Amino acid sequence: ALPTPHEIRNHLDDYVIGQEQAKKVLAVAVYNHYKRLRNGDTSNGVELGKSNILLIGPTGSGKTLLAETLARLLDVPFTMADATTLTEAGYVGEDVENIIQKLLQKCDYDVQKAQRGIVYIDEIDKISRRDVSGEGVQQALLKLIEGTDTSKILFICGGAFAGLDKVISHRVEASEGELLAQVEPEDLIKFGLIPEFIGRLPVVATLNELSEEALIQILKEPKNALTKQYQALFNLEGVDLEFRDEALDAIAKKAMARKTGARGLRSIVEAALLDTMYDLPSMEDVEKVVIDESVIDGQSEPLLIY
Amino acid sequence: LPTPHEIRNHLDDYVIGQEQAKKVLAVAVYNHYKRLRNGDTSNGVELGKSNILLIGPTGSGKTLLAETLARLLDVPFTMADATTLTEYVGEDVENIIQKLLQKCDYDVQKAQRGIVYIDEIDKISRDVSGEGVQQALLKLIEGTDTSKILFICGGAFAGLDKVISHRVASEGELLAQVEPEDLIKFGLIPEFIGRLPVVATLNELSEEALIQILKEPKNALTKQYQALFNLEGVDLEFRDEALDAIAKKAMARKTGARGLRSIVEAALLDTMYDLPSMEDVEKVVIDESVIDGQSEPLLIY
Amino acid sequence: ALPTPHEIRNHLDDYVIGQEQAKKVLAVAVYNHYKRLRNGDTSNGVELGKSNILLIGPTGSGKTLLAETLARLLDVPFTMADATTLVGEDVENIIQKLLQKCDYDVQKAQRGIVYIDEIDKIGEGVQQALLKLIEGTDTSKILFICGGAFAGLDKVISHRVEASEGELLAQVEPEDLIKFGLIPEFIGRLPVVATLNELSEEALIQILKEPKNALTKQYQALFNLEGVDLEFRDEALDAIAKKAMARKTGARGLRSIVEAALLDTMYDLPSMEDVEKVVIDESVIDGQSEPLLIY
Amino acid sequence: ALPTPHEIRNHLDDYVIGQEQAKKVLAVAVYNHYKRLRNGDTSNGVELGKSNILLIGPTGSGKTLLAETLARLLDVPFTMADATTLTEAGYVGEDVENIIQKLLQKCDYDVQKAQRGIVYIDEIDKISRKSDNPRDVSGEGVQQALLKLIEGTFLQVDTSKILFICGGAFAGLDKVISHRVETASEGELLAQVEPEDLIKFGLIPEFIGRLPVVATLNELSEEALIQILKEPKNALTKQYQALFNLEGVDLEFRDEALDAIAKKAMARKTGARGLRSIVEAALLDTMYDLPSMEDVEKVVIDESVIDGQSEPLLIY
Amino acid sequence: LPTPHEIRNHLDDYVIGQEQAKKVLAVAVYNHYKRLRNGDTSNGVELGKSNILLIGPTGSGKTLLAETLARLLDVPFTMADATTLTEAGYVGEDVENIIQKLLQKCDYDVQKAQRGIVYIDEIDKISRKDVSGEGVQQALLKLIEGTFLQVDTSKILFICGGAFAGLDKVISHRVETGSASEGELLAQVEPEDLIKFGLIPEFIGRLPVVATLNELSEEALIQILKEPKNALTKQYQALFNLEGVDLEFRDEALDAIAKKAMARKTGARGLRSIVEAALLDTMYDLPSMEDVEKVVIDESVIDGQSEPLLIY
Amino acid sequence: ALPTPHEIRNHLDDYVIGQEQAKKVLAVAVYNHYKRLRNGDTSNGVELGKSNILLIGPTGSGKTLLAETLARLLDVPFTMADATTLAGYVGEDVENIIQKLLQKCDYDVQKAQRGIVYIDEIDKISRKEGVQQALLKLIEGTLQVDTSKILFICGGAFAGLDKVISHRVEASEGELLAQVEPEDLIKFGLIPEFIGRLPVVATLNELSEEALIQILKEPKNALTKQYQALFNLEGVDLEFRDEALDAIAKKAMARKTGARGLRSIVEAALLDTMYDLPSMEDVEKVVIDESVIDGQSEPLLIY
């Protein structure tokens, strides 16, 4: 029994904050897609158009988080992929199908459930035209969107599109949130995306403010997360670095107030652990624990356990 | 083989207006396949390959025509963009061929009967990198075989309407006076234009054109959303005032036929969001729900 | 076995009409270039001079065609390049392109020919950058052929020699190109200078008939596989020539005229059942009356 | 045995004056860098992030001296390079690896020690492609070229192990920061510095991300400059006192004169750099007719520095 | 060691005017060699090497001052043009060429080669205001510090000459106040000004001693033709001398020669090319006559229509 | 006994035509140069300034001929050198010009110092470079032979020179090249330190019919040698009569194209011959005047 767009959006409120309009578009785009799979590709003599999605929002806005939750709420296999690891290769054409084998991997090799799966491509704005090779993916990955079958699987392309806020202004001529609503297929064309690619992404969603939980994940989940990197730098000191949740959240908030987004996470953490790293090799303690009082107030020093 | 008349008649079911352009495409396509069957050489004389160059605004139907031509002739069809090649791309030029074989079941013969449509040709017009493609992709036109495959190059040619005037009414009347030398000054090399003998010109679609595009085509937008609403147990009815409203919205945005979908989605957005959570008979879309996207669609229980 | 300038020019008469002087020059220049490659750069203690070619003629005179034809008649790799496009590291791009069509064979690529279009357009940096190639750093073996219209060249020559443009282009000198905009070190790398005349009214008519690939023969063969005989009257062929000159398109604009004159006919041709179709003058110049239809 | 950040900072106090915050940052950055090379790129299943440095401070604030000192204090091969020498050439991306051969040169061609070396690129702010102070296409190419080094790629030496320190005045950076933080002094503003501020300045996102650690330098104050003329083992006063010393004459710099030299330096904004050019023009006349006299000592008062009207006192 | 006074004094015999410049050079030169003899380190303190940067119009006496200094200290002297260095990496090995030429004029004596002087002309030319041009500033920089001759350039004194046409402007854009002559503007020169001109900081820091020359005036030019031990008039009076003919230059004729030199803006460099065009006809048919002396008047210089006076 | 400037100019009239002003300058310069070597570098307490020469004129004006002639008229060793063929290893190739001067001097150090050196195409190394200073080392003077004594003469066309002078002086090229100044050569691409070494400057205005004849024969890259080798690989021997070569010179002077317009003349006269050459079977082809001037008659064909 498929969840109505009302239900889909409802459970999305539990994992992501704000972004109500985008969550309305995704709820509809997702519903229609699976509502088309169950019934069939052809419906009453008419062929239904595949409605793939394009997420446009700043880094750490929750683009990745949204694509993940949609899969969990529909108990459907989910896999990620970076468009940057695809650029500059003709052999990556055999690496574009790699994203498919990973889908089957987390799908127990079930062909049918795999076709119901969702694929999220991060940083699509990066491949927009090296220019020839970068585009090579736009057209290589393009073969997937159609389906050779990848026709059934839903595609979600996320991107920050920094320069997108400028091209739209040169055409529509409020705030970035107001300008990103005026987005058009021709706007992405001037950005660096090919017409045949954009035509495959009918559904276009836009995010506004950053997501506290999104940023918090960027400081933890990634294999190269700041916290992980520092924990390892403190580790070769014979010192265990622990980040308390309150602290992480504190950090995210600071990054939003400064509108620096994920890009400004390090500058914060660095000033937070600056004093500690300086006089750390001059002490003898088991671990250092970072609290919220240390991050927000910047008043109290990080705790120390001997 | 279907006569040029038949080809033009089947194109009337998928594309609207552009009658002159479809007359040229019908003859060019007919002569091309008429040549392949007979042979490259005919009665001691060598026949000239007649490739096509579509020149029309964005959303005029340049791409649709191409796709339709292939379907009406049960011939493999592949698309490609010129901006993709500009600036190691010589080995990416042959990529368009492997894609043609992919949709051709790897049959060498049927692949030669295939049609290739390169979009945004006007973009590569120089700068050394753009020209390098006009000469690299040029190696395909002749054939090295890519000699048998039909090439259809499409483009908007924004600055073309200006150079023609500097040499020679409306843009449609000015695009009829187009000459090989006009594309030269535009940015295309002599050797390239000479490979594109046939030149078709498309006009700027009006209101009634867009309206029929939303209705007539077997894959019309309305038919699609009606089918989507249909598997919900609901009937979708687009009032005439509503469809004309969509067309106008499209014209105001200059997006042509391509902007049609983005318009239809916005209007039906709220509706499809709370459709499966109701229990009615049919939904009626009117002009008040499109032009301003203000009032909600009509719900009959 | 190298083809004599006689033979070379003779096979040029099969692809290009007129320009008999241009083709006599290209023949000797090309013959001597490869004759030097086979024998060697140094010959009998004397170092032979590399003879590169400079093609000067109106747009659509046959410059590009002459270059291409030279390559085919010598089974030698050929590659074009636009001087307007030119970038120092892009000058070597013309080379890799020559290797692409040469199957990456170093020896056959050195036997190759390169045509640089619109040299009159260039700026100076290119004249000196592309200069490094002419010498060779190897690009010493490859034959270079620089084409150009040189609109203002007809004037500078007149301000010195003080007939027709054909007569003046024959008085062309290295110093004339100097005043034009070319550097002394660049022109000195192009010893051979070939001039092409303007395809006249009679020349254009011949281009429509004489060539093995003339337009009339191409359309007569197209109408031929339809069971129809296509006939072009002389008054009609002259009409097309006049249409091309008024447009200053030259021979490049010949096809565009014939196509528009045979558009309506080819459209409703497979729908008829006649013996032959005759193209008269009224159908070309006027474009009002339809071609004659004999059943 | 690696020196602690305390130790490193401590020894930096023996060559560079003030900039305490900047030295604390450099001390941690440098420590971490070599603490990583010894342990290994990967540590306990986690990959350590390379911590290159970006020096932001006015001309003659101590950027060059700090870089050089760090290397001496760690017996490590040091080499410099101007970012201005990279622009205007297409093959200059090969002149970038030239900085590597110069590293091996001062390192005795030892592959291992060379990887432990430190590189300092001056005037990075000058290669930024922006509308501020209007070649952009060639300048940006450098940021992306030198970039390949930061990551790491016939020396065979990998540039992944060598520490990079990119210095630059960043004149207009004071401004862009103020157009963001708005709702104090430049020192207070350069503390508010953010990777996005440099972006608007003219640096590409891929380059800034390679420079995680950012150390800022304040404008050497009066008292700072005065100390520079006295305290340093090779201070100007101690140099001129040495030149006058081998003439049988004692040179005395009244504090009134030293602060006067500082002010002259501040007004010109030349920082510590413009120090020697001031002292020379003051002592030019005296040193000309010095070997032609016979007195005990020459006393330099303020009136010789500021006014430059009066001549130094001569004690017979 | 000659005192700065002596050094400047003997410079007066070779160069006219530029008294301030010679004062700067004298002091710098004195200190440099005063340093070499004593040693790099003196009394626990390291002395600062004081290299020179000459700044003045073309033909003001830059090159002459450099050369003269060497003769006044019997020291090996060699020139070089900064333009010969620009646009080359192989010129990094041509930078060391300047040293081998010094050793050449020094009989391959490593010590006396280290005491030598090197004058680099047209430094203002290599100012990137680029990559190849700057490549010299940093390459030639390596020398100024000091590094198979085995000679160290640390000891050798460097003198970088140049016109710096644009420097005149940048100095006015700084010293200006709200809303004098170039001589007065060139005195205000500061290390920061050269920075904006196109010289790298690390290079200017190696040229502490900065000297400035003024533009030679009429009376100045007039003296250059007479006073210098190798003045032109003295050279030609010797050429005519070995012909048994006395050459006399009227004051009115010398002043005329000065004016011609200014109108052409060639400074002192353009003097010779003026004297030669006047005495050309006369030197031609001189070994074919038999007179006592020749007298060059103004009418022969300015007008160039009338021939020199011949006395029998 | 040294020849007076009068005598020197008179014997130059026998080998070169026109260029009377230049020859007057060369006569004085050379006279004084050798008048200084005999007397001594220092004279009556005053050091005499070395007067090196800079020939400025069109290609084939007689720059090279004048130089050679001066040496013969003074029985003095003469050697040429191209500035083009002149790198860091070429710094040791610059001294090569010296060993060549000793070779033709029987390795006599004294007579070698009395020798004359002519450097061709100086206008070709002007940066607009390292050779200017590498060769500069010679002009001053450093085999053990000092180059301080040898007289230097640097010839060059200086194509762009005509322009730079016009942008300052603001007649014919002959009147413009008379206004030449040391600063003009500066902007052209010559370094100050080099121009200062060439005090005596001589300009030329007329082409030499004989000089052009030489260019067609003497040079290792002469047109005749280039075409004779082209005909040679055809099994044919190309012969240029003296009256045909001269015929070429005049044609080139009538068009004022100098030596740059010698190729386009020789081609137009051997164009027909080269066309139907690979289609014959003869021994040699003789080019006569009628073949050049008249252009009517074809070259003689010996079977």
XYZ file of C-alpha atoms in Angstrom, chain E residues 63 67 79-81 83-84 98 101 121-122 229-230 234-235 238-239 241-243 264-266 272-273 276 280-281 283-285 287-288, chain F residues 4-6 9 21 24-25 27-28 31-32 35 39 43-44 46-49 127 129-130 133 137 168 181-183 191-193 199-200:
66
model
C 77.546 53.268 -16.552
C 83.299 51.726 -14.373
C 79.000 44.628 -17.293
C 75.782 42.832 -18.168
C 72.351 43.673 -19.544
C 67.568 42.058 -20.958
C 69.973 39.234 -21.826
C 78.642 36.939 -15.820
C 83.714 36.934 -17.526
C 72.063 47.528 -16.902
C 68.369 48.011 -17.644
C 90.320 63.492 -18.858
C 88.755 61.584 -21.744
C 90.398 66.137 -25.983
C 90.022 62.930 -27.992
C 94.577 64.265 -30.197
C 93.357 62.774 -33.468
C 97.250 66.285 -33.229
C 98.865 63.228 -34.807
C 98.003 64.974 -38.074
C 67.189 64.974 -29.116
C 66.801 64.057 -25.440
C 69.780 61.728 -25.915
C 79.629 61.752 -29.819
C 77.180 61.209 -32.675
C 81.331 63.178 -35.495
C 83.274 64.171 -40.645
C 83.881 66.233 -43.775
C 88.571 64.338 -41.165
C 87.948 63.104 -44.702
C 90.111 65.587 -46.602
C 95.332 63.935 -44.587
C 95.189 65.614 -48.000
C 94.299 58.637 -46.992
C 90.479 58.695 -46.719
C 90.554 60.087 -50.255
C 87.204 56.091 -51.083
C 78.255 59.037 -48.396
C 83.242 58.482 -47.125
C 82.276 57.363 -43.625
C 87.056 55.656 -45.333
C 87.406 57.976 -42.350
C 91.686 55.315 -41.610
C 91.403 56.507 -38.010
C 95.895 55.406 -37.666
C 100.465 55.158 -33.222
C 98.236 59.076 -27.714
C 99.784 62.137 -26.053
C 94.747 60.910 -24.070
C 93.080 57.561 -24.751
C 91.647 57.366 -28.280
C 88.171 55.869 -28.721
C 65.106 41.720 -28.913
C 69.593 39.010 -27.440
C 72.231 37.300 -25.281
C 76.412 40.862 -25.016
C 82.782 40.923 -25.057
C 60.476 60.523 -33.910
C 70.200 58.043 -33.910
C 71.604 55.721 -31.197
C 68.240 55.918 -29.418
C 70.874 47.244 -26.207
C 72.520 50.514 -25.102
C 75.811 48.878 -24.140
C 80.071 54.828 -32.832
C 80.483 55.063 -36.607
